[PDB]
Amino acid sequence: ATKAVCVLKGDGPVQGTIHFEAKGDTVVVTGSITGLTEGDHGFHVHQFGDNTQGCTSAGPHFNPLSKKHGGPKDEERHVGDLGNVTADKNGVAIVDIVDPLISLSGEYSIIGRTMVVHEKPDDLGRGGNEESTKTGNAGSRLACGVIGIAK
């Protein structure tokens, strides 16, 4: 696939539409998320595209290379670690990310996996505690969706 899309939904008011486009050896991630509290919110690809138990069944961050959690510019990061999105005072986050590790084809393909936006900021593995190294202390999963193939 060259293009993909994800619609984020949850039990609360958070919702959004994320688009993905392969460009060169990168994936361009664009879209918007609404209903968030102003400030930063962790934003990652989780391993499974299983929404049988809401966002909980999506599993942990996508990590085929068995690394610790980090920020997007770090060498030591999960393939799914896309850092944070930032909501404004009206609860709207505009997504504009370029990433070279996620892919829409091959081994690191995220098609069929789940995008999740979280309750708190991702501390990018620099939190000083053990949870920082696993999840970034991003807390709750507010909304998620399975990444599908788009036209």
User: Out of 49, 72, 80, 125, which residue is the one contacting a copy of itself (CB under 8 A)?
Assistant: 49
User: Out of 36, 37, 52, 96, which residue is the one contacting a copy of itself (CB under 8 A)?
Assistant: 52
Q: Per rule CB under 8 A, is residue 146 in the interface with a copy of itself?
A: yes
Residue 30 contact among a copy of itself, Zn ion, Cu ion, none, beta carbon within 5 to 8 Å by kind: none
The response to whether 78 counts as a known ligand-binding position is yes
- Give me the least distance between CB of 64 and Cu ion, in Å please: 16
- Give me the least distance between CB of 83 and a copy of itself, in Å please: 23
How many residues sit close enough to a copy of itself to count as binding (CB under 8 A)? 23
Q: Which residues bind Cu ion (CB under 5 A)?
A: 44, 116
Helix, strand or coil for residue 88?
coil
Residue 116 contact among Zn ion, a copy of itself, Cu ion, none, beta carbon within 5 to 8 Å by kind: Cu ion
Give the E-state strand segments of 24-140 in sequence order: 26-34, 39-46, 52-55, 81-87, 93-99, 114-118
The CB-side HSE value for 54 (13 A sphere, CA atoms) comes to: 10
**φ, ψ dihedrals at 17, nearest 5°:** -130, 125
Calculate the CA 96 to chain-centre distance. 12
Instruction: Looking at residues 10 to 29 of the shown chain, list those that interact with a copy of itself (rule: CB under 8 A).
Output: 17
- Give me the least distance between CB of 50 and a copy of itself, in Å please: 5
**Euclidean distance between the first and the last CA atom of the chain, given in angstroms as a whole number:** 9
- Spatial distance between the Cα atoms of 37 and 92, rounded to a whole number of angstroms: 9
Q: Per rule CB under 5 A, is residue 141 in the interface with Zn ion?
A: no
Calculate the CA 42 to chain-centre distance. 7
